[PDB]
Design a protein around this motif. Sequence first.
Motif, PDB file in Angstrom:
ATOM      1  N   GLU A 137       9.426  15.101 -15.736  1.00 35.83           N
ATOM      2  CA  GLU A 137       8.377  15.138 -16.748  1.00 35.83           C
ATOM      3  C   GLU A 137       8.955  15.354 -18.146  1.00 35.83           C
ATOM      4  OE1 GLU A 137       5.469  18.218 -15.994  1.00 35.83           O
ATOM      5  OE2 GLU A 137       4.319  17.776 -17.809  1.00 35.83           O
ATOM      6  N   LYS A 138      10.002  16.169 -18.260  1.00 32.20           N
ATOM      7  CA  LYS A 138      10.511  16.532 -19.582  1.00 32.20           C
ATOM      8  C   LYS A 138      11.276  15.391 -20.242  1.00 32.20           C
ATOM      9  CE  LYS A 138       8.860  20.610 -19.769  1.00 32.20           C
ATOM     10  NZ  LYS A 138       9.914  21.567 -19.323  1.00 32.20           N
ATOM     11  N   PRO A 155       5.275  10.581 -23.551  1.00 32.74           N
ATOM     12  CA  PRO A 155       3.909  10.961 -23.157  1.00 32.74           C
ATOM     13  C   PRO A 155       2.968   9.778 -22.928  1.00 32.74           C
ATOM     14  CG  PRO A 155       4.176  11.296 -25.506  1.00 32.74           C
ATOM     15  CD  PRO A 155       5.504  10.758 -24.998  1.00 32.74           C
ATOM     16  N   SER A 156       3.325   8.574 -23.399  1.00 37.45           N
ATOM     17  CA  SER A 156       2.466   7.405 -23.188  1.00 37.45           C
ATOM     18  C   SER A 156       2.260   7.102 -21.711  1.00 37.45           C
ATOM     19  CB  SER A 156       3.043   6.153 -23.856  1.00 37.45           C
ATOM     20  OG  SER A 156       3.106   6.268 -25.253  1.00 37.45           O
ATOM     21  N   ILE A 157       3.333   7.158 -20.913  1.00 41.56           N
ATOM     22  CA  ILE A 157       3.247   6.797 -19.499  1.00 41.56           C
ATOM     23  C   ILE A 157       2.182   7.638 -18.809  1.00 41.56           C
ATOM     24  CG2 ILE A 157       4.531   6.674 -17.319  1.00 41.56           C
ATOM     25  CD1 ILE A 157       5.168   4.715 -19.915  1.00 41.56           C
ATOM     26  N   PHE A 158       2.164   8.941 -19.093  1.00 43.43           N
ATOM     27  CA  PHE A 158       1.189   9.817 -18.449  1.00 43.43           C
ATOM     28  C   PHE A 158      -0.226   9.513 -18.919  1.00 43.43           C
ATOM     29  CE2 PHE A 158       4.951  12.769 -18.061  1.00 43.43           C
ATOM     30  CZ  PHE A 158       5.110  12.510 -16.708  1.00 43.43           C
ATOM     31  N   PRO A 198       1.686   1.942 -15.008  1.00 43.28           N
ATOM     32  CA  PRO A 198       2.383   1.444 -16.212  1.00 43.28           C
ATOM     33  C   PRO A 198       3.271   0.236 -15.971  1.00 43.28           C
ATOM     34  CG  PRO A 198       3.130   3.666 -15.605  1.00 43.28           C
ATOM     35  CD  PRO A 198       1.979   3.354 -14.718  1.00 43.28           C
ATOM     36  N   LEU A 199       3.756   0.011 -14.747  1.00 42.66           N
ATOM     37  CA  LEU A 199       4.544  -1.187 -14.476  1.00 42.66           C
ATOM     38  C   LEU A 199       3.711  -2.457 -14.359  1.00 42.66           C
ATOM     39  CD1 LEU A 199       6.533   0.430 -11.533  1.00 42.66           C
ATOM     40  CD2 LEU A 199       7.051   0.606 -13.966  1.00 42.66           C
ATOM     41  N   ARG A 233      13.573   0.945 -17.687  1.00 42.25           N
ATOM     42  CA  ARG A 233      12.367   0.396 -18.292  1.00 42.25           C
ATOM     43  C   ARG A 233      11.963   1.201 -19.523  1.00 42.25           C
ATOM     44  NH1 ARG A 233      10.994  -4.821 -16.368  1.00 42.25           N
ATOM     45  NH2 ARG A 233      11.515  -4.850 -14.138  1.00 42.25           N
ATOM     46  N   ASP A 234      11.205   0.541 -20.397  1.00 37.33           N
ATOM     47  CA  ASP A 234      10.618   1.123 -21.598  1.00 37.33           C
ATOM     48  C   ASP A 234       9.187   0.616 -21.701  1.00 37.33           C
ATOM     49  OD1 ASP A 234      10.495   2.651 -23.984  1.00 37.33           O
ATOM     50  OD2 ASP A 234      12.429   1.890 -24.681  1.00 37.33           O
TER      51      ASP A 234
END
Lengths: 345, 345
Positions: free
Chosen positions: A124-125, A129-132, A141-142, A264-265
Amino acid sequence: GMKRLTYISKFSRPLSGDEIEAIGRISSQKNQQANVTGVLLCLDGIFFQILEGEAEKIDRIYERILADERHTDILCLKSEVEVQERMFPDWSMQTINLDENTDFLIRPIKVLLQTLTESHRILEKYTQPSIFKIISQGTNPLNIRPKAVEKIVFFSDIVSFSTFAEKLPVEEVVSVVNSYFSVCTAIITRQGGEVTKFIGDCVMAYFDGDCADQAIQASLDILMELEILRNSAPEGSPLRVLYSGIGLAKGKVIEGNIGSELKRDYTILGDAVNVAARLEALTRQLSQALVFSSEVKNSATKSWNFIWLTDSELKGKSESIDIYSIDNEMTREIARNIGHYLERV
Amino acid sequence: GMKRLTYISKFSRPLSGDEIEAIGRISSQKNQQANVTGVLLCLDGIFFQILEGEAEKIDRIYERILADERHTDILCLKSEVEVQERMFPDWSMQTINLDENTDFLIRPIKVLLQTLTESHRILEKYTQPSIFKIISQGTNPLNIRPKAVEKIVFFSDIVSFSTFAEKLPVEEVVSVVNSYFSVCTAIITRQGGEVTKFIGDCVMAYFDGDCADQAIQASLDILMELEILRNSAPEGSPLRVLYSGIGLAKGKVIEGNIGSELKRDYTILGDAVNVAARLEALTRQLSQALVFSSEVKNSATKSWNFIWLTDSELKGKSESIDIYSIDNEMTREIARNIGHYLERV
Ligand SMILES: [Ca+2]
Ligand SMILES: [Ca+2]
Ligand SMILES: [Ca+2]
Ligand SMILES: [Ca+2]
């Protein structure tokens, strides 16, 4: 028309077995009146919960759960929209306390659950924060389709960073950079922006394309907090010579599933390297801690105290753009001062 | 002197319940002869295993497990060195098949385990590979003490990227950038390097400070693969005009727990933005697809066909550095050609 959410959380204080039994029994009573079902589990100071029901009811219950003082660090792992069948139709809220369970087959399962959740909290760290945020909206997200979106892009950097690295022990350099990154990320997030990456000593962040007022206010607040930090640090502290330059521009960002099987980004800004280097040069050449382009100036709605400074070139292209700042007491060679102060400490 | 490892993996093909029972029974027999204990669980095509014993025996068993064709995507979640007590002292290998278990309390636990592992697999794609390497060595990445280390730094970029973004639909732009990122990451990783971040269209990677030969070879292999890609693409494909510039330099990198409570990183290269922008300018100004500094040239051990090109400035400082390339048929206005080709397609 049904929703189902799964989340994990941490005890905010020691809770006894009877308090956990009470949370479950009150949850069962309220859920029955709302037509909501699900399950609640606890293990070694971690909560796991699954809730299912009509979308509006689930949303209102979850907001209440987020405000409950008895747990913290809520993380939604999965949100399923347009759910077909209930998984727990006979359980308004079933409570399973794994601390008290001694069954033979469950013992190795408890070890596995604890190890997976701890690895998750580390991961998590190191993730944006976008993915969450995308996960909580019911989207993997994929699987997002690509989109181009206008953003205000924020870049901030540390003045004369190489002097810190040359004159201090490494543990001290890390202390300085972490103080800087903590200030920037707290203020950007408070004003609705999102930090996307660190690039060396540079912070890169996005604001929505019609949120220039918030990007300008975040920049002024960072400058104010750094002045307070410099003045209030102990005698001889390297924090006394921590200064920043900030530049804002507008850019076309692509959101999508970017990268390779290895890495990935979620977003890409083409030629970000070049825009950041040109803004850094401007703060140095103008001796101005905050600079931004005419496009940012024209997207703002409030009556800021704007001042025109010069023309420059920000994109790879050859168009000449007007550069502005804010004229106030805040924005009204540093590297030589830094080296001397750091030398004699 | 004991080790304990925990990992997850994926079935590489459908495995029946009897084949799983057979894996467990053979594992129990071999582990007993090696003084190793632990547990094996399966659920919906996922394996979970915990192994404990003497460090050398565990290491040799795990290497064999990594070569077993029957599963893939091995991820070590936890490695504990200098272990005190065994957790499963009476189990050479206990096998628990959760697909076949119908117990009342275990049903919601299976749902939770599946959801946590799936979220984990998503997070895996958005995180660096260094963190997982540190995890397998028995270290929590948030507890590392900071260190400064010399690296060869690699930067590569896409020539005239803005032309692609201006002339193609967004889904096509993403296809091009993903093809580029896949080529670069595959070759860098094969040569022992590590990709650390994407910065817009730029790939940033590290090689060990005495591995200049591997960094130069990776650069030449990327140039060769891109020429093959350009020549072999379909008629009218935008991949026919994908070109790259590459620059290598030496830098002092700090490894540690970097960042804020909101976002962490494992490494920082101060002024990375400035080094990358200066190398990009050099590949354009010299019309050379590969450039590197004298420091990189002097760290190489093989008899490369070096050629001196010019002097430049790479760091913020004012020292004048010799710039080199490799003289070969490979390295022996593109942007104007790109725009015209992309226009008429
Ligand atoms: Ca570029
Ligand atoms: Ca002008
Ligand atoms: Ca800098
Ligand atoms: Ca020279």
